[PDB]
Amino acid sequence: WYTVYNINDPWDENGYLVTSINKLVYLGKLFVTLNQSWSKLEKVAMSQIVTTQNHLSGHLRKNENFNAVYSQRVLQTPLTGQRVES
C-alpha cells in the first residue's frame, strides 16, 4: 500500500524543470525501494518454506504406511514462488 506524495505547486525555487527533476528522483527512489522490499519479503518466504520442508520430511520419513508415504511425496514436491498457487 504505497502513496505518491506530491510536489507543492504554488511554491518552487525554479519551475517546471526543478519540480520535474525532484519528481524523477523521488519516483526512482520509490520504485527501487518498493522492488527491493518486495524481493526481500519473497526471498524470506521462499527461504522459510524450503527450510520447513526439510524438517517436515525428516520427521515424516520413518513410517511405511501408504498414506504416510503419499503424504511424504506430496509434501516433498519441490516449490517455487511461481509454482506455489497450484
Binding site: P10, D12, E13, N14, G15, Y16, L17, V18
Partner: protein, 148 residues
C-alpha cells in the same frame, strides 16, 4: 480617441486645454476638427497594437516597474507611480516570478513588443523632408541637404 467619447462641453473643456501648445517659446493651435471617420481608421490600428502589446508583454516588464520602485526611489519615478496609482483598471497579477531560463521566449516577446511600438510610431511619425546644415543669422533662410 477622446471625441469618440461623445459629450457636451467636455469636448470643449478638453480642446481648449489641449490645442494651444508651446514649443520653442511659440504658441500655436489648430481649430475646427469636425472629427471625421478618417482619423478613426488611423486610431483603430493604434488600438490593435495596444491590445497586442498587452497580450505579448513579458513577465519581466510589469515586474520591472514594481522592482525598481522597491530598489530605487525618485520624484520622477513617483510621477509614474502616480499614473499607476491613478489608474488600476487591469489588476490581473501573474503567478510565477522564477524566470527559470525562458530566455528565448523572452527575446521573442520583447521583439514583438518593440515591433508593435514601431507600428504606433509609424502612425504618429511624419516623413522628414529636409535636413538643415547652415542657418542664416536672420533665421530666415537655411540650407538643407535632402529633398524628400
Amino acid at each position: 480617441l477622446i471625441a469618440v467619447h461623445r459629450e457636451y462641453n467636455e469636448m470643449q473643456t478638453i480642446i481648449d486645454e489641449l490645442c494651444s501648445i508651446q514649443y520653442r517659446d511659440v504658441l500655436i493651435k489648430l481649430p475646427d476638427i469636425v472629427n471625421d471617420k478618417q482619423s478613426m481608421y488611423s486610431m483603430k490600428t493604434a488600438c490593435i497594437s495596444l491590445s497586442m502589446i498587452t497580450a505579448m508583454a513579458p513577465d519581466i516588464v510589469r515586474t520591472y516597474i514594481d522592482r525598481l520602485t522597491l530598489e530605487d526611489h525618485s520624484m520622477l519615478l513617483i510621477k509614474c507611480q502616480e499614473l499607476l496609482s491613478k489608474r488600476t483598471t487591469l489588476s490581473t497579477q501573474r503567478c510565477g516570478q522564477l524566470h527559470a531560463t525562458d530566455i528565448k521566449d523572452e527575446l521573442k516577446k520583447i521583439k514583438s513588443v518593440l515591433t508593435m511600438i514601431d507600428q504606433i510610431n509609424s502612425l504618429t511619425n511624419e516623413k522628414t523632408y529636409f535636413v538643415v546644415c547652415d542657418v542664416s543669422a536672420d533665421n530666415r533662410m537655411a540650407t538643407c541637404i535632402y529633398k524628400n
